[PDB]
Subunit: 351 residues, 4 copies
């Protein structure tokens, strides 16, 4: 077997050490744009988010309303694919034709929207998604280091060339990243086990601390860029517990962040608002729970998250803190933060 | 005194990082066969389990019914030796003559069965066990790094040659493994302290994290194979808390796993089913407890484990998860898993 | 991004190993004097505290009474600047003209007093503070690694030369220290996150274990002294939970210590004494709390600390323990302690 | 300041890895003798304990009855010196003249007994102790790395030469050991902070994990023996929580062990037996508590320990476990254990 010199770590084990803050760095001047899909050196990505946040490919998170609400703030949602092909297409179509600011839109002023796909019914699902107007796709899986993802991406490239963007994952190391990059992925998703509704131990026992995973994949991605001139955006998916974890994920090299629990709390998530002993909550279940697969064990859990109100106010408060921290680190942009951030590990006792 | 460069670790401190999963790797195609006794290079073991699980040499675990139930699924039980020689022989005989699938049987279609022996009355116990039809024996001890085990194995070899298979242990490092290998053991059992009914601290203070023990013994075993051409199967005994710990133990090099608590929960264990406030439990006590030795201190404990029903359904669910994880690691067989597994240590905080 | 070879640590992770205690080292002979502002090699500081303790630049800690009570024992208070310029000046003036022992006074026998200032209204606030008689100033900020502090210090030097002393901070590493030193700071304050009313995680996620911060800044400060002949006193601000943490902070190189919670408990702090179910408490809130800024988030908290009585008796008990420990380390003075202290890290388990 | 490459550890962080157990190693054949005072190479110590246990120099532990009860089993007690010179002498005299097995006696068949002394009234106390018949003395202090201990030992050597044996301490590193060795100590006591009634943190903040302290002092002691031919026995004082900690302390190099709490639980300790809600307890307070010094702070605590009955049965049970573990390590004697023990550190998570 193969072992490692250091144990893996989660975002909670890190802190940012301030850098020189210049007079021109104020939150309002911080630019949170970031690339969504791959491009060659000297070019810009064909799709740039206004904010580095995307909602998870989950039944309890990314519905029609979530996609519109998030696109309006500059991010993008990946409509869950764990439903009928026609149901998913309808949601995508409803978002693209909603208008029939930092809004994320296409050349027709229509909100951008993503859609999750699987390695099984993609021959029928992809065409429907494209026809419906999906701006980008993403293969949704707990272990993307699979020949099935290579086959899926390959089929897409053979029928649509580079006109259809498709993200792949999830992986947690340089090898997995490399495999999906050579396969043609437009962006690679990082993370196995970090999620909130994730009980890694009581499951398969596969995974890696999110911080270690991002740091390792980012180094491979940068190495890959130097060898081929191809820059592949990476997404840190899961493991975000506090707002500052967002800044950490970006500082470590992630171009954008995928969140489930965070967005599930909003009015715009597709779940039921439930009042439990004076507290308003929202339903939240993992895609691995039996509650979701049904569309003696269980890959995820079914629980509740506290109601936080509308997405807008919460995302604004979260990103204001990110912007402020970025200025503490001497960064006016995400690339500058990734370049200048001073990140330290914290001792067990400190926690 | 002699010290080590690194502290020891338990299975809970590790996670598996996925490898390339090929299209041909599906749980149903995973082969869980594994060697039970030693063989020379170029040969196959004379006894191969269909599944890498064996039930512990304990009064509260391996009785007649357990041995039959486990053999039927492909594993083997070691009838406890902490009873009269005639009582143990009767159980062994009852298993071998029960018939008077992935079943583990001999050339006569009879279920395979093991039997534990001690370093004291082996001159009278072994013959009775052999005569009764025991397929394999195993010296049961908390510290197998003993001249007594060498003497016991030697006596067996002098009277039966290599016709009678005998496992030895337990040990936790390369030196202990080496001593038992040169002594002639057919398989060596790893583990001191890991057990569930083990309170190492409040005992002698001897032991080692199970993961570190297995990793160290496996390296010595591989070194031993290269020097002599003799492959000695090793057994990871104790310390298995979750199903994924099984995959970890195998990935680290253990050929098979010995479990006590896990099997004690089944209908087939020889203990009393007790209902405590709406919960059906099963009795479980260590071989070191006064409750067992009686056949001011105490080497083990006497407690309860939750009833899990029949062995079949539980073992199947456990091994399906192992098989699935193996495919995540790109392995269709145990040897392939031991060769390809990527194993990472996890930080204290992560736990 | 930039990473570090070791994780950061807090004061609770360290212990002092005794050195040779000579017959002449008794608590009563221990000298606790220490420099407040910078000086050149071969010289002495223009201001030396009699005891290495200063009260925090906070509304709930450093008022008129605190400043008088602390100066009387040999330390100094920094009147909080989070109030009107005229209100702060009045407090400073009241302290300087209170008389209209180990007392800390100027050549006119008047108690010494400090005053906090900010990087915004300093052009109007400084003159008022100087005119009122403030002996030393200090820029109060969560991240002193800022061009704004450079600008503020520069303005002071252009209008008052080296006649007005001004401390800067807070910083946590050699780079931050270096930036403020070159900027002209008379003393540099260390610490971000350590404070008691600090919830670093649920904030920006910036900071560093106080011990690691002090050790790193002290090494840079000593390096700076060797290169330029300028000795800049450093202050360990926050993170002091127990009396022995004081000895640790000094042993690690800090010239003096800034405390908030510690002093808030005294009769002389400007907050309300509140009786909660038989326990007399004192109010205490951070400068980052909304309760203080008002002069959807929050940089600090608003809580209670147990009443400890008058400052005198408590400070005396605290420093007697420091003096005693110093003798255990073979030190009669702070510089001798910084030179001879043997400091060991403690394992996680030990805690 | 001076730092260390590794953090310190306590006994709870270690486990013993078994060695080869030979047929001749059975508990009954294990020899637990050990040297009490220093000797030259090629010689034997003038005083050898039959068992490596000595009771602490405390008011709540070592009285007349304890000294007799322990000597009868082969150990020795150090009558507490925190009492009048005439009271301590009376106890010593009562023990030496009690008779007016593994018993520890002098050439006159009288029980051996020790007596604690301090660095202040030794000119009057020592003579009284010698005259009373004390077999060995020991300077009792929280920090023995003091010129006062050198002066005390020197005075004893000037008036009695090498006829009066005197132990010194406590120290926790090679430097402290070395200082007391050159000063003439007959044995050196290790340990600061480890004790049960020790709240190191809420005190001076001086100390070191007991295991690290013993390991470091033992290496210095062995180095000292090689340079001078003088073997100085060392005592691991405090930090013993479980029986196996005894085996660890010895394996690490300590010749004998000093215990307070352990012995306080016995019928023979000089404290009151108190029944608290069905549980019989014994009083136990540290020598640093105000309750003891009286013969605003506090170096120790005043609590209760569970009644364990007579010393005999408990010590026998404890040492049987030590002997058994020694055989697991292939040792028939303490020196053999110190030479052959395989000691591993355990991970934080394991605990
Ligand atoms: O262990 C898991 N069991 C599940 O059932 C599950 N469903 C989703 N996911 C993954 O978790 C991410 C969302 O995580 P958060 O709620 O932490 O933001 C998502 O983006 C996915 O990567 C799961 N992980
Ligand atoms: O500390 C111990 N005290 C005992 O009384 C005891 N009895 C058995 N064993 C050992 O534990 C293994 C079973 O462990 P699990 O229940 O964890 O599977 C078994 O296979 C044995 O190796 C003991 N260990
Ligand atoms: O996280 C924080 N939120 C706040 O609201 C706050 N107010 C003050 N400070 C800083 O804490 C120091 C006082 O700390 P102690 O109470 O621990 O002595 C002070 O000296 C400051 O450095 C804050 N830190
Ligand atoms: O922190 C302390 N405060 C006290 O008041 C105290 N009194 C004794 N000792 C020391 O502790 C040893 C006994 O420890 P145990 O009870 O752990 O065996 C003793 O042998 C001493 O080394 C003290 N340590
Ligand atoms: C697919 O959604 C996920 C993702 C992205 C992740 C995990 C996970 O459990 C699920 C749900 C698991 C499902 C629906 C079962 C199918 C499968 O195995 O892919 C995880 O642990 O890391 C990432
Ligand atoms: C023999 O069964 C075991 C085994 C295999 C192990 C342990 C143990 O305590 C017992 C019971 C201990 C008994 C019956 C006392 C005799 C003896 O000492 O052998 C353990 O700690 O690691 C492995
Ligand atoms: C200024 O007082 C502090 C100091 C010294 C520190 C911290 C802090 O939160 C505050 C309050 C934060 C305020 C008033 C908001 C303005 C700002 O950001 O400066 C901290 O974390 O380390 C040091
Ligand atoms: C003297 O008995 C001890 C010993 C041996 C130790 C400690 C201790 O606190 C006391 C009591 C402390 C007293 C009586 C105050 C006088 C002094 O300081 O010596 C400890 O921490 O390590 C070892
Ligand atoms: K900054
Ligand atoms: K895979
Ligand atoms: K000393
Ligand atoms: K052994």
């Amino acid at each position: 077997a193969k072992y490692y010199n250091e144990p893996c770590h989660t975002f909670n084990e890190y802190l940012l050490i301030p850098g020189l803050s210049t007079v021109d760095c104020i939150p309002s001047n911080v630019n949170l744009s970031t690339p969504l899909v791959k491009f060659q050196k000297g070019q810009q990505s064909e799709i740039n988010l206004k904010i580095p946040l995307v909602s998870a490919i989950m039944q309890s998170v990314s519905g029609e309303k979530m996609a519109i609400a998030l696109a309006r703030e500059g991010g993008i949602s990946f409509i869950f694919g764990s439903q009928s092909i026609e149901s998913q297409a309808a949601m995508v179509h409803a978002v693209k034709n909603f208008k029939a600011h930092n809004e994320l839109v296409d050349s027709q002023k229509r909100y951008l929207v993503g859609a999750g796909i699987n390695t099984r019914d993609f021959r029928e699902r992809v065409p429907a998604l494209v026809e419906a107007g999906a701006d980008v796709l993403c293969i949704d899986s707990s272990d993307g280091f699979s020949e099935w993802q290579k086959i899926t991406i390959g089929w897409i490239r053979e029928k649509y060339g580079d006109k259809v963007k498709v993200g792949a994952g999830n992986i947690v190391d340089g090898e997995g990243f490399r495999y999906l990059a050579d396969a043609g992925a437009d962006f690679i998703k990082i993370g196995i086990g970090g999620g909130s509704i994730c009980i890694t131990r009581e499951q398969k026992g596969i995974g890696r601390g999110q911080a270690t995973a991002v740091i390792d994949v980012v180094a491979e991605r940068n190495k890959y860029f130097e060898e081929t001139g191809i820059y592949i955006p990476v997404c840190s998916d899961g493991g975000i517990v506090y707002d500052y974890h967002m800044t950490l994920a970006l500082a470590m090299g992630a171009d954008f962040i995928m969140l489930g629990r965070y967005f599930a709390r909003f009015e715009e998530s597709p779940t039921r608002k439930v009042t439990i002993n004076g507290s308003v909550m929202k339903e939240y279940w993992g895609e691995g729970s039996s509650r979701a697969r049904n569309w003696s064990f269980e890959e995820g859990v079914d629980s509740y998250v506290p109601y936080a109100g509308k997405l807008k106010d919460n995302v604004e408060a979260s990103l204001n803190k990110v912007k402020s921290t970025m200025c503490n680190c001497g960064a006016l942009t995400i690339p500058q933060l990734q370049s200048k951030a001073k990140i330290t590990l914290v001792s067990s006792v400190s926690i």
